[PDB]
Amino acid sequence: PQVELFVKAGSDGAKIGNCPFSQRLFMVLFLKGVTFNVTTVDTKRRTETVQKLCPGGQLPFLLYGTEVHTDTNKIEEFLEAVLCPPRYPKLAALNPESNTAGLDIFAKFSAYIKNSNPALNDNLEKGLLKALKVLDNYLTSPLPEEVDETSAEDEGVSQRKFLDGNELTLADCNLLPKLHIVQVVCKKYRGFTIPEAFRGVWRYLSNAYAREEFASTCPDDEEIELAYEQVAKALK
């Protein structure tokens, strides 16, 4: 039941370019265990075969047998439905709040980085910091799984690896690619690093970069930066 995910090509028209939607889906497929392959699509120069499978020009899309599926959320939702137990595992989060913790982070970042008027830099940066703290608190709050089970050093603090427990879920597939863009781009163009004092968020990124499903699906730093260069370099 052949699985082909079509994703945005980077600056040389071949390699992985910047796209959080592509990476999220790429991650879902590694995590599912399915046999699959990825085709990169140069969005300035779609091949004729790609033009014909996705006449609308959406991206990413997914070839499943002979059907093309568009819209990332619906693609994901369909991968969860059709690649299901017992032959593949359920990836969706158990706790609803895991799907919405730090959702706002990527919008606040975008605002922050598209802005070019120095007067606004500070308030937008605090927007971003606050969104990261909501996330941090969610990462340091014990989930129901962890109830009343701790050791003396770090009572009240969670020790789970990812958003919803110790297994990557769908919620991580959405968040991690976005946070990864936030870090690379804000470091390069805004003199900004996620504060060390958000130890949840750091401990979380550490656990992420430790898993090939995420680190193998990241675009090269240079592709992310090039991708954001025009919009980001405008603030003087």
Side-chain angles (χ1 to χ4, degrees):
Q2 297 60 45
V3 191
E4 212 198 333
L5 179 71
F6 290 71
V7 311
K8 194 190 150 188
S11 63
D12 67 351
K15 68 153 94 189
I16 299 170
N18 179 76
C19 178
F21 316 114
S22 291
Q23 183 175 359
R24 165 184 173 189
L25 291 178
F26 207 149
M27 281 186 69
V28 169
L29 285 177
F30 274 123
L31 278 170
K32 285 302 205 180
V34 70
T35 297
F36 75 107
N37 302 290
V38 166
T39 302
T40 53
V41 179
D42 182 348
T43 67
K44 297 166 195 168
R45 180 170 144 109
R46 295 176 185 243
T47 60
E48 290 182 10
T49 300
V50 166
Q51 230 155 303
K52 200 166 169 317
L53 291 164
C54 197
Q58 295 91 342
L59 204 67
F61 67 92
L62 172 87
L63 183 66
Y64 197 91
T66 65
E67 288 153 21
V68 169
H69 293 260
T70 68
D71 184 311
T72 295
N73 290 305
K74 308 178 179 228
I75 284 162
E76 180 166 279
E77 182 177 284
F78 166 82
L79 296 171
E80 179 80 345
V82 57
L83 308 177
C84 67
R87 188 173 178 186
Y88 308 100
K90 282 282 154 159
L91 291 188
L94 295 164
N95 309 272
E97 199 172 349
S98 293
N99 304 309
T100 59
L103 255 197
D104 49 4
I105 286 168
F106 195 65
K108 289 285 201 299
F109 160 67
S110 293
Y112 185 42
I113 212 84
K114 295 190 136 81
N115 173 66
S116 54
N117 187 315
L120 286 126
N121 180 60
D122 209 74
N123 195 50
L124 295 171
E125 190 171 277
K126 307 208 181 195
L128 178 65
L129 281 185
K130 180 78 170 269
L132 285 170
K133 182 209 171 281
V134 174
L135 181 49
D136 194 71
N137 292 167
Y138 182 72
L139 289 169
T140 60
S141 264
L143 305 160
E145 247 301 308
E146 297 166 71
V147 71
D148 298 330
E149 84 199 7
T150 24
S151 73
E153 171 91 344
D154 297 319
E155 289 176 341
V157 178
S158 174
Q159 319 298 351
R160 75 204 192 260
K161 287 166 201 134
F162 313 118
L163 275 170
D164 199 66
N166 298 290
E167 310 299 348
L168 286 164
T169 62
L170 301 176
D172 302 296
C173 297
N174 188 343
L175 183 59
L176 282 164
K178 280 165 180 154
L179 270 173
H180 176 76
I181 291 161
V182 171
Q183 314 175 244
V184 176
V185 175
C186 295
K187 194 167 293 125
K188 172 81 180 154
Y189 295 107
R190 295 281 180 267
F192 176 81
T193 58
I194 312 176
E196 291 295 338
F198 298 137
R199 322 270 175 186
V201 179
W202 283 107
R203 178 180 65 74
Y204 172 52
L205 289 171
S206 258
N207 296 310
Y209 291 109
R211 292 289 299 269
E212 66 182 353
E213 298 97 336
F214 171 56
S216 81
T217 55
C218 293
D220 293 342
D221 288 358
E222 175 175 30
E223 293 299 308
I224 295 164
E225 303 163 357
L226 286 180
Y228 278 83
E229 200 206 299
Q230 188 187 278
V231 289
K233 85 183 169 86
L235 173 82
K236 318 290 188 227

mmCIF file with all atom_site columns, all heavy atoms in Angstrom, residues 205-224:
data_model
loop_
_atom_site.group_PDB
_atom_site.id
_atom_site.type_symbol
_atom_site.label_atom_id
_atom_site.label_alt_id
_atom_site.label_comp_id
_atom_site.label_asym_id
_atom_site.label_entity_id
_atom_site.label_seq_id
_atom_site.pdbx_PDB_ins_code
_atom_site.Cartn_x
_atom_site.Cartn_y
_atom_site.Cartn_z
_atom_site.occupancy
_atom_site.B_iso_or_equiv
_atom_site.pdbx_formal_charge
_atom_site.auth_seq_id
_atom_site.auth_comp_id
_atom_site.auth_asym_id
_atom_site.auth_atom_id
_atom_site.pdbx_PDB_model_num
ATOM 1   N N   . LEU A 1 205 ? 13.851 19.680 24.237 1.00 0.00 ? 205 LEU A N   1
ATOM 2   C CA  . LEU A 1 205 ? 14.624 19.769 23.009 1.00 0.00 ? 205 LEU A CA  1
ATOM 3   C C   . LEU A 1 205 ? 15.783 18.761 23.029 1.00 0.00 ? 205 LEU A C   1
ATOM 4   O O   . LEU A 1 205 ? 16.028 18.079 22.057 1.00 0.00 ? 205 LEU A O   1
ATOM 5   C CB  . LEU A 1 205 ? 15.160 21.203 22.846 1.00 0.00 ? 205 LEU A CB  1
ATOM 6   C CG  . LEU A 1 205 ? 14.127 22.307 22.509 1.00 0.00 ? 205 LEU A CG  1
ATOM 7   C CD1 . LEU A 1 205 ? 14.720 23.715 22.577 1.00 0.00 ? 205 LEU A CD1 1
ATOM 8   C CD2 . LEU A 1 205 ? 13.512 22.074 21.128 1.00 0.00 ? 205 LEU A CD2 1
ATOM 9   N N   . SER A 1 206 ? 16.465 18.642 24.160 1.00 0.00 ? 206 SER A N   1
ATOM 10  C CA  . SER A 1 206 ? 17.513 17.635 24.311 1.00 0.00 ? 206 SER A CA  1
ATOM 11  C C   . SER A 1 206 ? 17.009 16.245 23.964 1.00 0.00 ? 206 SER A C   1
ATOM 12  O O   . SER A 1 206 ? 17.621 15.528 23.146 1.00 0.00 ? 206 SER A O   1
ATOM 13  C CB  . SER A 1 206 ? 18.045 17.597 25.762 1.00 0.00 ? 206 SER A CB  1
ATOM 14  O OG  . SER A 1 206 ? 19.274 18.260 25.883 1.00 0.00 ? 206 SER A OG  1
ATOM 15  N N   . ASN A 1 207 ? 15.936 15.842 24.633 1.00 0.00 ? 207 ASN A N   1
ATOM 16  C CA  . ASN A 1 207 ? 15.330 14.534 24.363 1.00 0.00 ? 207 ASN A CA  1
ATOM 17  C C   . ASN A 1 207 ? 14.958 14.419 22.864 1.00 0.00 ? 207 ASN A C   1
ATOM 18  O O   . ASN A 1 207 ? 15.105 13.369 22.265 1.00 0.00 ? 207 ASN A O   1
ATOM 19  C CB  . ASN A 1 207 ? 14.123 14.280 25.289 1.00 0.00 ? 207 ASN A CB  1
ATOM 20  C CG  . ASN A 1 207 ? 14.517 14.204 26.773 1.00 0.00 ? 207 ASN A CG  1
ATOM 21  O OD1 . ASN A 1 207 ? 15.451 13.483 27.142 1.00 0.00 ? 207 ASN A OD1 1
ATOM 22  N ND2 . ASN A 1 207 ? 13.793 14.948 27.639 1.00 0.00 ? 207 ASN A ND2 1
ATOM 23  N N   . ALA A 1 208 ? 14.501 15.511 22.251 1.00 0.00 ? 208 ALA A N   1
ATOM 24  C CA  . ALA A 1 208 ? 14.128 15.500 20.793 1.00 0.00 ? 208 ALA A CA  1
ATOM 25  C C   . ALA A 1 208 ? 15.320 15.277 19.861 1.00 0.00 ? 208 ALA A C   1
ATOM 26  O O   . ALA A 1 208 ? 15.291 14.409 18.964 1.00 0.00 ? 208 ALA A O   1
ATOM 27  C CB  . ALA A 1 208 ? 13.420 16.786 20.383 1.00 0.00 ? 208 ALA A CB  1
ATOM 28  N N   . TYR A 1 209 ? 16.343 16.092 20.037 1.00 0.00 ? 209 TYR A N   1
ATOM 29  C CA  . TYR A 1 209 ? 17.507 16.033 19.163 1.00 0.00 ? 209 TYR A CA  1
ATOM 30  C C   . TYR A 1 209 ? 18.175 14.663 19.342 1.00 0.00 ? 209 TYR A C   1
ATOM 31  O O   . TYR A 1 209 ? 18.828 14.168 18.446 1.00 0.00 ? 209 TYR A O   1
ATOM 32  C CB  . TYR A 1 209 ? 18.469 17.221 19.429 1.00 0.00 ? 209 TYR A CB  1
ATOM 33  C CG  . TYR A 1 209 ? 17.888 18.567 18.980 1.00 0.00 ? 209 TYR A CG  1
ATOM 34  C CD1 . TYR A 1 209 ? 17.476 19.557 19.902 1.00 0.00 ? 209 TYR A CD1 1
ATOM 35  C CD2 . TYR A 1 209 ? 17.735 18.856 17.622 1.00 0.00 ? 209 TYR A CD2 1
ATOM 36  C CE1 . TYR A 1 209 ? 16.923 20.775 19.480 1.00 0.00 ? 209 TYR A CE1 1
ATOM 37  C CE2 . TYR A 1 209 ? 17.176 20.077 17.200 1.00 0.00 ? 209 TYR A CE2 1
ATOM 38  C CZ  . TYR A 1 209 ? 16.767 21.037 18.137 1.00 0.00 ? 209 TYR A CZ  1
ATOM 39  O OH  . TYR A 1 209 ? 16.196 22.234 17.655 1.00 0.00 ? 209 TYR A OH  1
ATOM 40  N N   . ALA A 1 210 ? 17.956 14.026 20.487 1.00 0.00 ? 210 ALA A N   1
ATOM 41  C CA  . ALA A 1 210 ? 18.426 12.645 20.731 1.00 0.00 ? 210 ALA A CA  1
ATOM 42  C C   . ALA A 1 210 ? 17.715 11.535 19.899 1.00 0.00 ? 210 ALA A C   1
ATOM 43  O O   . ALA A 1 210 ? 18.214 10.406 19.833 1.00 0.00 ? 210 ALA A O   1
ATOM 44  C CB  . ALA A 1 210 ? 18.346 12.333 22.234 1.00 0.00 ? 210 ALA A CB  1
ATOM 45  N N   . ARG A 1 211 ? 16.586 11.852 19.268 1.00 0.00 ? 211 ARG A N   1
ATOM 46  C CA  . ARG A 1 211 ? 15.798 10.876 18.478 1.00 0.00 ? 211 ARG A CA  1
ATOM 47  C C   . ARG A 1 211 ? 15.924 11.138 16.981 1.00 0.00 ? 211 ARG A C   1
ATOM 48  O O   . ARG A 1 211 ? 15.669 12.276 16.516 1.00 0.00 ? 211 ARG A O   1
ATOM 49  C CB  . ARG A 1 211 ? 14.332 10.981 18.855 1.00 0.00 ? 211 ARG A CB  1
ATOM 50  C CG  . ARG A 1 211 ? 13.994 10.513 20.255 1.00 0.00 ? 211 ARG A CG  1
ATOM 51  C CD  . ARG A 1 211 ? 14.093 8.992  20.390 1.00 0.00 ? 211 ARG A CD  1
ATOM 52  N NE  . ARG A 1 211 ? 13.164 8.290  19.502 1.00 0.00 ? 211 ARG A NE  1
ATOM 53  C CZ  . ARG A 1 211 ? 11.923 7.911  19.806 1.00 0.00 ? 211 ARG A CZ  1
ATOM 54  N NH1 . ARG A 1 211 ? 11.386 8.153  20.992 1.00 0.00 ? 211 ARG A NH1 1
ATOM 55  N NH2 . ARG A 1 211 ? 11.206 7.288  18.884 1.00 0.00 ? 211 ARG A NH2 1
ATOM 56  N N   . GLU A 1 212 ? 16.357 10.114 16.235 1.00 0.00 ? 212 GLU A N   1
ATOM 57  C CA  . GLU A 1 212 ? 16.621 10.243 14.794 1.00 0.00 ? 212 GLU A CA  1
ATOM 58  C C   . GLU A 1 212 ? 15.376 10.695 14.001 1.00 0.00 ? 212 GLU A C   1
ATOM 59  O O   . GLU A 1 212 ? 15.505 11.362 12.965 1.00 0.00 ? 212 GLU A O   1
ATOM 60  C CB  . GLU A 1 212 ? 17.168 8.916  14.211 1.00 0.00 ? 212 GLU A CB  1
ATOM 61  C CG  . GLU A 1 212 ? 16.143 7.776  14.258 1.00 0.00 ? 212 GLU A CG  1
ATOM 62  C CD  . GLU A 1 212 ? 16.645 6.415  13.741 1.00 0.00 ? 212 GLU A CD  1
ATOM 63  O OE1 . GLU A 1 212 ? 17.785 6.296  13.191 1.00 0.00 ? 212 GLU A OE1 1
ATOM 64  O OE2 . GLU A 1 212 ? 15.854 5.448  13.871 1.00 0.00 ? 212 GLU A OE2 1
ATOM 65  N N   . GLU A 1 213 ? 14.187 10.367 14.512 1.00 0.00 ? 213 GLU A N   1
ATOM 66  C CA  . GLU A 1 213 ? 12.929 10.717 13.856 1.00 0.00 ? 213 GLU A CA  1
ATOM 67  C C   . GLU A 1 213 ? 12.772 12.211 13.742 1.00 0.00 ? 213 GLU A C   1
ATOM 68  O O   . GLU A 1 213 ? 12.181 12.699 12.788 1.00 0.00 ? 213 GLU A O   1
ATOM 69  C CB  . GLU A 1 213 ? 11.717 10.104 14.553 1.00 0.00 ? 213 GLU A CB  1
ATOM 70  C CG  . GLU A 1 213 ? 11.708 8.560  14.572 1.00 0.00 ? 213 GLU A CG  1
ATOM 71  C CD  . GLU A 1 213 ? 12.251 7.997  15.874 1.00 0.00 ? 213 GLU A CD  1
ATOM 72  O OE1 . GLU A 1 213 ? 13.039 8.725  16.543 1.00 0.00 ? 213 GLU A OE1 1
ATOM 73  O OE2 . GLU A 1 213 ? 11.886 6.844  16.246 1.00 0.00 ? 213 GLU A OE2 1
ATOM 74  N N   . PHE A 1 214 ? 13.375 12.945 14.665 1.00 0.00 ? 214 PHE A N   1
ATOM 75  C CA  . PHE A 1 214 ? 13.319 14.385 14.617 1.00 0.00 ? 214 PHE A CA  1
ATOM 76  C C   . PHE A 1 214 ? 14.599 14.981 14.019 1.00 0.00 ? 214 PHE A C   1
ATOM 77  O O   . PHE A 1 214 ? 14.537 15.812 13.089 1.00 0.00 ? 214 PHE A O   1
ATOM 78  C CB  . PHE A 1 214 ? 13.042 14.931 16.009 1.00 0.00 ? 214 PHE A CB  1
ATOM 79  C CG  . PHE A 1 214 ? 13.175 16.415 16.099 1.00 0.00 ? 214 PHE A CG  1
ATOM 80  C CD1 . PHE A 1 214 ? 12.431 17.242 15.267 1.00 0.00 ? 214 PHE A CD1 1
ATOM 81  C CD2 . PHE A 1 214 ? 14.039 16.994 17.001 1.00 0.00 ? 214 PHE A CD2 1
ATOM 82  C CE1 . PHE A 1 214 ? 12.565 18.599 15.317 1.00 0.00 ? 214 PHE A CE1 1
ATOM 83  C CE2 . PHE A 1 214 ? 14.151 18.369 17.065 1.00 0.00 ? 214 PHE A CE2 1
ATOM 84  C CZ  . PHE A 1 214 ? 13.421 19.157 16.218 1.00 0.00 ? 214 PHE A CZ  1
ATOM 85  N N   . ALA A 1 215 ? 15.762 14.534 14.503 1.00 0.00 ? 215 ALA A N   1
ATOM 86  C CA  . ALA A 1 215 ? 17.007 15.123 14.047 1.00 0.00 ? 215 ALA A CA  1
ATOM 87  C C   . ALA A 1 215 ? 17.289 14.777 12.562 1.00 0.00 ? 215 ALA A C   1
ATOM 88  O O   . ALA A 1 215 ? 17.811 15.626 11.825 1.00 0.00 ? 215 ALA A O   1
ATOM 89  C CB  . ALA A 1 215 ? 18.166 14.731 14.953 1.00 0.00 ? 215 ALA A CB  1
ATOM 90  N N   . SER A 1 216 ? 16.930 13.563 12.129 1.00 0.00 ? 216 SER A N   1
ATOM 91  C CA  . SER A 1 216 ? 17.025 13.189 10.689 1.00 0.00 ? 216 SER A CA  1
ATOM 92  C C   . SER A 1 216 ? 16.026 13.939 9.778  1.00 0.00 ? 216 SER A C   1
ATOM 93  O O   . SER A 1 216 ? 16.229 14.020 8.558  1.00 0.00 ? 216 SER A O   1
ATOM 94  C CB  . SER A 1 216 ? 16.900 11.664 10.469 1.00 0.00 ? 216 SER A CB  1
ATOM 95  O OG  . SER A 1 216 ? 15.544 11.238 10.479 1.00 0.00 ? 216 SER A OG  1
ATOM 96  N N   . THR A 1 217 ? 14.970 14.502 10.342 1.00 0.00 ? 217 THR A N   1
ATOM 97  C CA  . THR A 1 217 ? 14.005 15.212 9.511  1.00 0.00 ? 217 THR A CA  1
ATOM 98  C C   . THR A 1 217 ? 14.176 16.733 9.527  1.00 0.00 ? 217 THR A C   1
ATOM 99  O O   . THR A 1 217 ? 13.435 17.432 8.846  1.00 0.00 ? 217 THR A O   1
ATOM 100 C CB  . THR A 1 217 ? 12.571 14.820 9.869  1.00 0.00 ? 217 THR A CB  1
ATOM 101 O OG1 . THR A 1 217 ? 12.360 15.024 11.267 1.00 0.00 ? 217 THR A OG1 1
ATOM 102 C CG2 . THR A 1 217 ? 12.288 13.340 9.492  1.00 0.00 ? 217 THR A CG2 1
ATOM 103 N N   . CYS A 1 218 ? 15.132 17.260 10.292 1.00 0.00 ? 218 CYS A N   1
ATOM 104 C CA  . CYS A 1 218 ? 15.378 18.699 10.302 1.00 0.00 ? 218 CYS A CA  1
ATOM 105 C C   . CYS A 1 218 ? 16.051 19.101 8.989  1.00 0.00 ? 218 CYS A C   1
ATOM 106 O O   . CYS A 1 218 ? 16.915 18.369 8.448  1.00 0.00 ? 218 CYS A O   1
ATOM 107 C CB  . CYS A 1 218 ? 16.242 19.138 11.501 1.00 0.00 ? 218 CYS A CB  1
ATOM 108 S SG  . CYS A 1 218 ? 15.465 18.956 13.159 1.00 0.00 ? 218 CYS A SG  1
ATOM 109 N N   . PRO A 1 219 ? 15.648 20.247 8.446  1.00 0.00 ? 219 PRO A N   1
ATOM 110 C CA  . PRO A 1 219 ? 16.431 20.873 7.372  1.00 0.00 ? 219 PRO A CA  1
ATOM 111 C C   . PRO A 1 219 ? 17.724 21.464 7.910  1.00 0.00 ? 219 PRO A C   1
ATOM 112 O O   . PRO A 1 219 ? 17.797 21.798 9.096  1.00 0.00 ? 219 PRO A O   1
ATOM 113 C CB  . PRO A 1 219 ? 15.507 21.998 6.854  1.00 0.00 ? 219 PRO A CB  1
ATOM 114 C CG  . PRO A 1 219 ? 14.149 21.663 7.354  1.00 0.00 ? 219 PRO A CG  1
ATOM 115 C CD  . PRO A 1 219 ? 14.343 20.889 8.622  1.00 0.00 ? 219 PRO A CD  1
ATOM 116 N N   . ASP A 1 220 ? 18.729 21.631 7.063  1.00 0.00 ? 220 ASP A N   1
ATOM 117 C CA  . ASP A 1 220 ? 19.992 22.175 7.533  1.00 0.00 ? 220 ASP A CA  1
ATOM 118 C C   . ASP A 1 220 ? 19.779 23.596 8.030  1.00 0.00 ? 220 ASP A C   1
ATOM 119 O O   . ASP A 1 220 ? 18.951 24.327 7.493  1.00 0.00 ? 220 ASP A O   1
ATOM 120 C CB  . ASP A 1 220 ? 21.044 22.130 6.415  1.00 0.00 ? 220 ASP A CB  1
ATOM 121 C CG  . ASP A 1 220 ? 21.441 20.697 6.046  1.00 0.00 ? 220 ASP A CG  1
ATOM 122 O OD1 . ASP A 1 220 ? 21.159 19.775 6.882  1.00 0.00 ? 220 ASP A OD1 1
ATOM 123 O OD2 . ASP A 1 220 ? 22.042 20.491 4.960  1.00 0.00 ? 220 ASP A OD2 1
ATOM 124 N N   . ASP A 1 221 ? 20.505 23.994 9.050  1.00 0.00 ? 221 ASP A N   1
ATOM 125 C CA  . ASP A 1 221 ? 20.369 25.349 9.574  1.00 0.00 ? 221 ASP A CA  1
ATOM 126 C C   . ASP A 1 221 ? 20.365 26.346 8.448  1.00 0.00 ? 221 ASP A C   1
ATOM 127 O O   . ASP A 1 221 ? 19.528 27.282 8.442  1.00 0.00 ? 221 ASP A O   1
ATOM 128 C CB  . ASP A 1 221 ? 21.490 25.726 10.552 1.00 0.00 ? 221 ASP A CB  1
ATOM 129 C CG  . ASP A 1 221 ? 21.368 25.021 11.894 1.00 0.00 ? 221 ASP A CG  1
ATOM 130 O OD1 . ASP A 1 221 ? 20.409 24.256 12.111 1.00 0.00 ? 221 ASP A OD1 1
ATOM 131 O OD2 . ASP A 1 221 ? 22.237 25.257 12.751 1.00 0.00 ? 221 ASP A OD2 1
ATOM 132 N N   . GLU A 1 222 ? 21.273 26.167 7.492  1.00 0.00 ? 222 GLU A N   1
ATOM 133 C CA  . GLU A 1 222 ? 21.408 27.142 6.411  1.00 0.00 ? 222 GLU A CA  1
ATOM 134 C C   . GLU A 1 222 ? 20.090 27.210 5.626  1.00 0.00 ? 222 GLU A C   1
ATOM 135 O O   . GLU A 1 222 ? 19.673 28.283 5.263  1.00 0.00 ? 222 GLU A O   1
ATOM 136 C CB  . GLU A 1 222 ? 22.673 26.928 5.522  1.00 0.00 ? 222 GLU A CB  1
ATOM 137 C CG  . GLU A 1 222 ? 22.758 27.881 4.316  1.00 0.00 ? 222 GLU A CG  1
ATOM 138 C CD  . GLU A 1 222 ? 24.043 27.782 3.479  1.00 0.00 ? 222 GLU A CD  1
ATOM 139 O OE1 . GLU A 1 222 ? 24.669 26.686 3.397  1.00 0.00 ? 222 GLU A OE1 1
ATOM 140 O OE2 . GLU A 1 222 ? 24.424 28.809 2.876  1.00 0.00 ? 222 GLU A OE2 1
ATOM 141 N N   . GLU A 1 223 ? 19.380 26.113 5.428  1.00 0.00 ? 223 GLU A N   1
ATOM 142 C CA  . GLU A 1 223 ? 18.141 26.214 4.669  1.00 0.00 ? 223 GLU A CA  1
ATOM 143 C C   . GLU A 1 223 ? 17.095 26.997 5.449  1.00 0.00 ? 223 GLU A C   1
ATOM 144 O O   . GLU A 1 223 ? 16.446 27.843 4.869  1.00 0.00 ? 223 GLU A O   1
ATOM 145 C CB  . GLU A 1 223 ? 17.587 24.842 4.245  1.00 0.00 ? 223 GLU A CB  1
ATOM 146 C CG  . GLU A 1 223 ? 18.462 24.121 3.233  1.00 0.00 ? 223 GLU A CG  1
ATOM 147 C CD  . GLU A 1 223 ? 18.617 24.883 1.962  1.00 0.00 ? 223 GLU A CD  1
ATOM 148 O OE1 . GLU A 1 223 ? 17.574 25.266 1.421  1.00 0.00 ? 223 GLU A OE1 1
ATOM 149 O OE2 . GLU A 1 223 ? 19.752 25.124 1.506  1.00 0.00 ? 223 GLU A OE2 1
ATOM 150 N N   . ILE A 1 224 ? 16.923 26.732 6.749  1.00 0.00 ? 224 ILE A N   1
ATOM 151 C CA  . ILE A 1 224 ? 16.012 27.559 7.575  1.00 0.00 ? 224 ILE A CA  1
ATOM 152 C C   . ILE A 1 224 ? 16.332 29.091 7.512  1.00 0.00 ? 224 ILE A C   1
ATOM 153 O O   . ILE A 1 224 ? 15.485 29.908 7.149  1.00 0.00 ? 224 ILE A O   1
ATOM 154 C CB  . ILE A 1 224 ? 15.969 27.047 9.043  1.00 0.00 ? 224 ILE A CB  1
ATOM 155 C CG1 . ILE A 1 224 ? 15.340 25.630 9.081  1.00 0.00 ? 224 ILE A CG1 1
ATOM 156 C CG2 . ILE A 1 224 ? 15.170 27.980 9.911  1.00 0.00 ? 224 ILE A CG2 1
ATOM 157 C CD1 . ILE A 1 224 ? 15.572 24.874 10.361 1.00 0.00 ? 224 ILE A CD1 1
#
